[PDB]
Amino acid sequence: GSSGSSGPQIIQFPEDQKVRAGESVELFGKVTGTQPITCTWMKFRKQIQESEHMKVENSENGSKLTILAARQEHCGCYTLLVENKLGSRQAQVNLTVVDKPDPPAGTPSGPSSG
């Protein structure tokens, strides 16, 4: 007798977001299924390389991909792959790097400035 254990799936994952050049982002994709479970972080059909700019923490709950000192090149669509004796899965998320400060303000009764 057994219930579920169909395959690795990503129920949680970040969507198209932005990031300031130099800031720090944390992209985690919760995965469910039957452990052990493999998880790889790639981008634009290119496996990411763990470095002082991009860190990865592979764990049960899922896989995380930290981006230190976000660079202009870091900007792009990533892909979280998760394979396991059961099956496999692949997600996608768009990212954009901005080296500009906070956006302009001009809302009525907003920041209450001026």
Cβ atoms of residues 39 and 61 within 8 Å: no
Q: Kindly give, in sequence order, each residue whose CB lies less than 8 Å from that of residue 18, ignoring residues fewer than 6 positions away.
A: 95, 96, 97, 98
- DSSP designation for 47: B
Identify the CA nearest to 22 among candidates 49, 53, 57, 48: 53
How far lies 36's CA from each of 33, 75, 79, in Å? 9, 31, 20
Q: What is the dihedral of CA 76, 50, 9, 83, to 10 degrees?
A: 120
* CB within 8 Å of 40: residues ≥ 6 apart: 47, 63, 80, 81, 82, 83
Residue 17: exposure state from Cβ atoms within 10 A (0-12, 13-18, ≥19): exposed
Assign domain 1-114 one CATH number from 2.60.40.10, 3.40.390.10, 3.40.640.10, 3.40.50.300. 2.60.40.10
Contacts for 60 with CB less than 8 Å, ≥ 6 apart: 35, 37
